[PDB]
Amino acid sequence: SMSVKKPKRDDSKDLALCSMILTEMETHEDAWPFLLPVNLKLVPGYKKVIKKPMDFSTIREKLSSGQYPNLETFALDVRLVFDNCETFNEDDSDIGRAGHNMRKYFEKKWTDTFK
Known part of the structure; x- marks a missing residue:
């Protein structure tokens, strides 16, 4: 509340670490349904x-141009990619399986980097 703050978490490396994670997602072999x-x-x-x-x-493009105010808004868009994939694709399809694999991969990197 006013004049009462939790201790300050260092967030000065978040931009670079989100970029690194995004690079690892871009270069995964099962990324092809999600690149464009x-x-x-x-x-x-x-x-x-x-x-x-x-x-x-x-x-x-959003990351590079300062359109993520914080690391949670970045995680929401990544998760949105997989949630859309599940909405439109059968689990037992190449694209459906790709989505499940990428989500797993993302969530581990996210936990290891930030939690």
């Missing part, structure tokens, strides 16, 4: 069903 925006002209149903499209390139 889904083409809304060529994939029937996507536009209407997926209210907030997200992909790694869009995350990378």
Whole structure:
């Protein structure tokens, strides 16, 4: 509350560490369904069903241009990529399995880097 603060967590390396994690996600072999925006002209149903499209390139541009106010808003967009994937793809498909694998990979890096 006013004039009463928890001790200050050092957040000065967060930008660089989020960038490193994003690089590791970009370079994973199962990243291919997530590197670019889904083409809304060529994939029937996507536009209407997926209210907030997200992909790694869009995350990378937001990161580089100071559009993440903190590391939680960054984690929300990453998770949004996998949540969208689960909404549109069967678990037993290549893309469905890719999503589950990438989410697991992300969550471990996140915990090891920050928790």
